[PDB]
Amino acid sequence: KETVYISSIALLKMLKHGRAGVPMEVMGLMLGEFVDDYTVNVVDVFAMPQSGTGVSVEAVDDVFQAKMMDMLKQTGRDQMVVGWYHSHPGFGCWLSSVDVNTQKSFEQLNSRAVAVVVDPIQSVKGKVVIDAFRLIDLNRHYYSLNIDYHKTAKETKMLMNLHKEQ
């Protein structure tokens, strides 16, 4: 079974970004590493700008992406694009036909690529509405992967400041 591990900052950025974009869909890239055939670590993400074309391969601004990736390298983040995320405000986590086409473009660049989908409207305490997909290699076109969260001890202590009195 395949698992996408999502880091603390990755998750918070994707929820934050999705909520900021409402009522529009948003998208960004996921950074991390392919650990083995069944494991993807997503250690970070970054947002792509809203485009007129809506969320599709056309929405990927190669100039923006190259500048952002180069500037991230300069400050210690030089992880592989391991996939992309997009929001579905109010209508749940799945891939539309256009989403499948986007994901096919990501897969042609790197067959291990993952599509994460988050719903910022239906996400509430304590229900994050999120899923991760790859396309299949009558049959369905895509399938869901397990999601889990990786946090360090240092990160755990840091997060506990939010309701520190508890």
């Binding site: 934050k16 300069q74 400050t75 755990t156 997060l159």
Partner: protein, 174 residues
């Protein structure tokens, strides 16, 4: 007095500062430095995002440091294309304490912020009793420039609240 009264910091910013420090393998006495984003238009400064900066400083000489001005402008320009509500409001470093060069570094950020810059120290080692954050704005006294210490709280909008709870679930259980 019309001075800022207090500062709130999003959990993302704390985690971003920590990730910056760790991913650059920052090693003692050194610190990492970056930009903070949010809203400083009121007596409550709200720190809601951040990005890392290239930064280098001379151990042998506090007066010697370098910040990439071009990096600040180029990254902020991308941040603006993503969310214009999150303005450049100051800078952060990993401390854990105020350093001799901070009032001079602060003067540089003053060229980029509309507000009087906020300095946020995020103690990524987390050896303090309370919050791993200390917030400062530069003021005149007597006359000379000095940092005024502002109280901090950690606060999250609903999205982050949901995220943090989700991340700490397995710890809550235990």
């Amino acid at each position: 007095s019309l001075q800022h009264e207090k500062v709130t910091i999003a959990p993302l910013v704390l985690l971003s500062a920590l990730d910056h420090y760790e991913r650059t393998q920052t090693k003692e006495n050194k610190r990492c430095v970056g930009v903070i984003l949010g809203d400083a238009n009121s007596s409550t400064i709200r720190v809601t995002n951040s990005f890392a900066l290239p930064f280098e400083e001379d151990e042998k000489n506090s007066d010697v440091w370098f910040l990439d001005h071009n990096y600040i402008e180029n990254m902020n320009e991308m941040c603006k294309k993503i969310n214009a509500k999150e303005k450049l409001i100051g800078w952060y470093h990993s401390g854990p304490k105020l350093r001799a060069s901070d009032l001079k570094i602060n003067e540089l950020f003053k060229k980029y912020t509309q507000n009087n810059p906020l300095l946020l120290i995020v103690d990524v080692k987390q050896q303090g009793v309370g919050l791993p954050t200390d917030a400062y704005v530069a003021i005149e006294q007597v006359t000379e420039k000095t940092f005024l210490h502002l109280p901090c709280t950690i606060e999250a909008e609903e999205a982050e609240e949901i995220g943090v709870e989700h991340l700490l679930r397995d710890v809550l259980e235990v």
